[PDB]
Design a protein around this ligand. Structure first.
Ligand SMILES: [Mg+2]
Ligand SMILES: [Mg+2]
Ligand SMILES: [Mg+2]
Ligand SMILES: [Mg+2]
Ligand SMILES: [Mg+2]
Ligand SMILES: [Mg+2]
Ligand SMILES: [Mg+2]
Ligand SMILES: [Mg+2]
Ligand SMILES: [Mg+2]
Ligand SMILES: [Mg+2]
Ligand SMILES: [Mg+2]
Length: 190
RNA sequence: CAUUGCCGCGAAGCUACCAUCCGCUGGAUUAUGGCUGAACGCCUCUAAGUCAGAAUCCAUGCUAGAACGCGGUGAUUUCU
């Protein structure tokens, strides 16, 4: 169809600075800073009144309009992640063998070590990505809390811990074992 | 002498899974499982982007070295 103009809104709240040269977006707030290279898209950003940035596609087909609301959602994720921050909570699910996860250092690389998953002698190792801060819940039994600015970094680190603890050669309908994400939320949320 | 006459042992050399030694580790991926995320206010591994991942692939390594591919360097003829 090639719609003439599709357009989206981005609400920049009171503490946030958004800076967009060519298609590289820099979002600065109370929690740090974030950068995305959006040069694969071809949208056009325009600043209206310092609390609002439009993003537009001119003469765009169905897939090109489709990526426009993606670009809105990604910058809003950056804005949320530098104002409220991002926080994931994972619980350990085990039947018989308890799962031992402690935050570990190997050559200054800050891994996550998982011993005794299903009684495996194999120690599993997940590296902590930068920005993600691993926490172990007090007054919740067997909960790991991943916190940081990027929802891309926090959720992929929470994805990597689930993916390393998969169950092999068993019926996974019964062998329900692993570390699963229980909550996707913010840090400064109430 | 017996077309190495025959028999036992027999060094050297060659040799035998009939004897010993030795046979490397990184990256990119497929299937698949994911993250973020629209389309399609929700949902979604996919559309943009991105993670992991096979005995696969491509390197590392190993063999040859273009006899018309290349480089460094040595010496370059007389009482002739
Ligand atoms: Mg599996
Ligand atoms: Mg079986
Ligand atoms: Mg005679
Ligand atoms: Mg004789
Ligand atoms: Mg052999
Ligand atoms: Mg999802
Ligand atoms: Mg895939
Ligand atoms: Mg894709
Ligand atoms: Mg990958
Ligand atoms: Mg190598
Ligand atoms: Mg040659």
């Amino acid at each position: 169809m090639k719609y003439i103009q599709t357009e989206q809104q981005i609400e920049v709240p009171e503490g946030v600075t958004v800076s967009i040269k060519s298609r590289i977006v820099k979002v600065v707030g109370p929690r740090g800073t974030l950068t995305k290279n959006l040069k694969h898209i071809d949208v056009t950003f325009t600043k209206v009144n310092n609390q609002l940035i439009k993003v537009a596609v001119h003469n765009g087909g169905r897939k090109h309009v489709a990526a426009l609301r993606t670009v809105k959602s990604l910058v809003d994720n950056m804005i949320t992640g530098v104002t409220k921050g991002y926080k994931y909570k994972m619980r350990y699910v085990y039947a018989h063998f308890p799962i031992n996860v402690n935050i570990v250092e190997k050559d200054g690389a800050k891994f996550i070590e998982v011993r005794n998953f299903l009684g495996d002698k194999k120690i599993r190792n997940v590296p902590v990505r930068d920005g993600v801060t691993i926490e172990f819940s007090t007054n919740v039994k067997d909960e790991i809390v991943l916190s940081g600015n990027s929802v891309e970094d926090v959720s992929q680190n929470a994805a990597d811990l689930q993916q390393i603890c998969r169950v092999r050669n068993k019926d996974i309908r019964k062998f329900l074992d692993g570390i699963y994400v229980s909550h996707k939320g913010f840090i400064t949320e109430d």
